[model samples]
Target chain A: LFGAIAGFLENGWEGMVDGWYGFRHQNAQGTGQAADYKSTQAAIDQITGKLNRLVETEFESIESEFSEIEHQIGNVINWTKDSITDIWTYQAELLVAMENQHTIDMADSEMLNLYERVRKQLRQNAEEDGKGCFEIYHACDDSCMESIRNNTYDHSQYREEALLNRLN
Target chain B: DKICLGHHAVANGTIVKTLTNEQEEVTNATETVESTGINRLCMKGRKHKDLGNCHPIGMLIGTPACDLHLTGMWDTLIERENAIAYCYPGATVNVEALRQKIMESGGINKISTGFTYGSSINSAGTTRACMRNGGNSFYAELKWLVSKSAGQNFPQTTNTYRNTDTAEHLIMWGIHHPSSTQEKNDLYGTQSLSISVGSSTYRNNFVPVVGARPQVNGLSSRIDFHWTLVQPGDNITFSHNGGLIAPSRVSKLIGRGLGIQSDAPIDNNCESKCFWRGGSINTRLPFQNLSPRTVGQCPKYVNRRSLMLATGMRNVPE
Candidate 1:
């Protein structure tokens, strides 16, 4: 695949040269004798532009869908607090689905590259703190469930679980 | 006066001979046939018979048919350029069909007149006349020193030749209702006839070039004449600064015809593609004649042959 990509890059360079020459000739003489060379350049440009736009659009749509899947996974994790293993398994499944979609979105590399660039920039804004959630909630009322639903679990509860893990 | 038989100086050239045939005891002429050096035998004028084969095999060479009437004669005879077939009186067949037939046979080389048909009764109609290439370039022929030359300048030099009153009628056949792809099928079975004048929106859609001409009738208008009909002894006159005179006066004074040439080829596009691939050459196809060579054949060719006979030999029954 790398070799094929390299070959295309090489031809693309040559096409650029031929295109320039054709442009010069066309300007010098109004006749269309050098039209083939110019058309080849234009066709290449169309293909490249189409590829870039496709990758960009597809990845953007997939990423937006991925964020929704991530939120659903967080909900499932909170709802099954007592069954941590089950919650983790469901979260993994959600990740798998998202990854599969991402793969499909990358099928057209030119567009994929464009989406990847935008995704990388957005990833920078995400939280870096270890605000992990894994514990049974002692909720006495609906407020506790709502807090859990919002991923606003008590920091003390999370810290206690982490300490217990270290001791074990 | 006997319609004297005139022979082209060259043997394989179009003679348009009004010859007296010995066997038929009647005089007949062949439609100009492009010569292949074969001696053409005049065929006896037969009733409802394809006698084109009987005319002595001779070259059909002549000035390219022009769409304009006699006005185009000066260009052919003097300028040495071929023209499109012009509609003329006394022609038995439709001028458009005849012009197309001649062009397809490789007999035509050039075409003139954009889309607008001519003004004169004899000038109306569409035609594609062929030209001989590289040989006797009219310019080259003129350059060669002539032993003796005498001619007067054409008097109707500045007069408008291509009249738009004609184009208004010819373009009527192109108008049709617009429909989407899915609805196209439903409209096909329905019969509808719509007439569109040259300036109408429908006419403008196809013929953008044929805008308004201020020269004819002072007001600019699109012209596409139907060339209603032609008759014998129709007084075709040529006009100059002072007044009008018989066509003879124009021809005698300038040594050329005053009417426009009808031999310039017509544009072959969309609704106006030549009726046959080799317009006039279509006539030469075997099926186009009476008694098809094979049995159980559809008779589309008969329509043209019938028209040719009715037009060429007038009053002949199919």
Candidate 2:
């Protein structure tokens, strides 16, 4: 159980960091000239010229940092995936032993709820970690031309709405 | 084919008013000229072209006005809308008439003392005209090098608070805290001045009489004044340059336009032009009762003389 939890954590952090940085980099690139004076015919032309140069520097910094972070996180995800697969097989054997000793009861509602929560978390961690690596590696290699792509298949909006509803 | 200057998409099909050489006038051949509601502008000549970037003229014609047409030289007015006519000859301005003009023209842009030649004097005129017309925002300067030519009435100071009815002053640059309050105090036998801009504190120190000290620690930007220093009814405001500065709403005395002394100097000899271009004139321009030497730099006579004798173009061609 310890190995399984550690594996899940390792992959989960990598996935979250990759997703956040990916979105941040894209946002920084797309947001152009937030200032009104970027348009022509306004007084203080010299000041606007300096602001344009500053925007260019911001873009360079975002790209450089994103590249370094995404690469290291991708490598970590691969190692954690292997560890998680090994722990899954070991956990199955342990579950069988606990059941045989009459220590594991499948009928309790509280026990079932806890088991469901753990299963859901582990599944999400594995899938997101795999999906993040696929997206990052493809984008970095230029194999995928589009700026965004996704592979996780669970499309239900229930979790999203309950946790992060826009209306609220 | 008719040609045009600038980008064709932005410029083409726009009517160009070609001016006649005999007089400084642009004639528009089109009869369907739209009348811009703006009243301060007066145009000459015939055959109107499409109103381009330049404000449409002929708006103030047949009115008692004079055209001080200038070319190449840069121009700025001391007060909003109303033309200050101290130095520029061949130009006529009626303060009462222009006051009505400003009312008709919606309102005038409140200029600071730094934008005029007689900083104190023109400031006095501009402030009086603006306040009388119910304008709240005006610009002021913080520092000016006292010139030797300033006469005895150059440096003036006041601490009255009656003109505080209007939210008259707005400081241009400072941290804005919409939560501060206005306060007044008595330092000596004389009264003291304190103002607020946005969120920062600005307690006034009239020691050097050069400029108002932008004290940041002791003032609030909030316009409320339940805790003020005035003794109920002792002549609330001080009047200088025909304008009044009231103590009741001292925190609202915010600076609107901020003037920075540019490295560039005006080649024009007129003191009025200096005031117009170099931020503001002598300190006396904003207050009426304030003596020239007490709050101004150049004496009124020398400033007028230098301004009238200035050979450089005072304004761009209209």
Candidate 3:
């Protein structure tokens, strides 16, 4: 075992990977803190090992993850810049499809106005804030739709009048 | 009539990342997490995981710029860059996403944040700025700075300790009259300085005089970060003898943006005419638009009515 000297050398060697320990390693060499290696290959092996862990391994992980996610993104078409109204229709369709349930208000002004507000907000953000279509998807499809679903759930839609219990 | 309604939320919060190179075990190094309520709400869509949030339109193809194994002039000839933005390595980010964590967090006439590199192998990210009736200040905790990257680190100071890549840290400030609707303003100034790390460098530190040396190759729980304060107006340009790579190789401003800090907490979430007035904090400035798309060209940026004329779907008339 290399002991404290081994640990220092290991740290120094690993430091060369991204220069994190570059100075530290340099300092070790400056102060002659390296443990005596049996041969040059041992030192070479140490550097190689460090490189494997730092760069190579992580690079593989990065590639695999990025590749898979990119593919998934390609499949899921969540954003659009086409018609802002499509953002609304997409959600309306989704709500209707959720459990084959539809709540129709001859378009209440309160809800309609709020929708207009969200629409305008998104448009402005797209311009000044440089928000893109993906954000549109999040705002409309996920967050807004979910928010409405939660607030609009009706207890009156309960199934059977002949239910076993009418406990208040 | 029942309708779901919500304000436009952003991925707002601080993700303090610690980066190290290789072969290091992250121990009881309890990293902090205070992603805001809005932040949590912003990411609640988990049923079908959000992929395009940070996905660059086409940059997801090919090898990452960071992974290119090049040596000397031989590698320079084949100008094959992956469809990736150098801003954040593997994570694909569009020109807009490349901007800031949150652009003018809420409304107009507010403070904003510029973006940072992915501190880990995972993400690119934000933080707050201080503001007052008088002047706001800047605060940054510089930890394991970039020691070794693909290209060379520059400046080459004579002293062995302080010899490596030196980016002149600039916190430029500005102002805009209330009537002006332009994206930028005037009154820019620089509190300039330099920062370096690695085998041939020295120091731990910043602009209004902060300090630090280099961290380890991989991340560690050591006290390596140095906190510095800028008097105010910390927009930027980290220039000097040249960049870490080649001169004019990459721009500091390209695809970058600002996150102005507000004097008071202003979530003025009103849908229309919700511009915030009064003081604002400065965190980096907004750079140029994406590589080459004019503002007119982007469907989302231009008028909504005209979107269908471009590549949009049919207008859904209510």
Give the top-scoring candidate (DockQ).
Answer: 3
lDDT of 2 by residue, A18-122 (tens): 221122112322421111111212223323433443353132332343455577766776688679899988987875575434321211222233324333533
Return the lDDT, model 2, position B111.
23
The digit string of per-residue lDDT tens for model 1 on A41-61 reads 533554454445445313233
lDDT of each: 0.25, 0.25, 0.23
Residues B200-279 of candidate 3 have per-residue lDDT tens digits of: 12223222222232323221111211111122323223322111110111111212222321222323231111111121
Per-residue lDDT for B124-168 in model 1, tens only? 112121122533221110011111111211122122122233211
- Tens-place lDDT per residue, model 2, B1-318, is 898664212111222221111121222223222111111111122111111111101112111121221111112211223333221011222334433332223212222222222443322212221121254222121111121233223323343333223433322221112221111111111222223211122232112111223333232221111112222222232222111221111222122221111222322333321222222233333222212221113224221211111222222232
Q: Against the true structure, what is model 1's DockQ?
A: 0.00
Query: By the TM-score metric, which is better: model 2 or model 3?
Result: 2
What DockQ, between 0 and 1, does each candidate earn?
0.00, 0.01, 0.03
lDDT of 3 by residue, A1-168 (tens): 212222222323542342221111112123212222222333344445534544531323323434555755444433432355687789768745642321112112223333334345443222211221112211232333332223442223321321223322
Interface RMSD of 3: 5.3
Candidate 2 docking band: incorrect
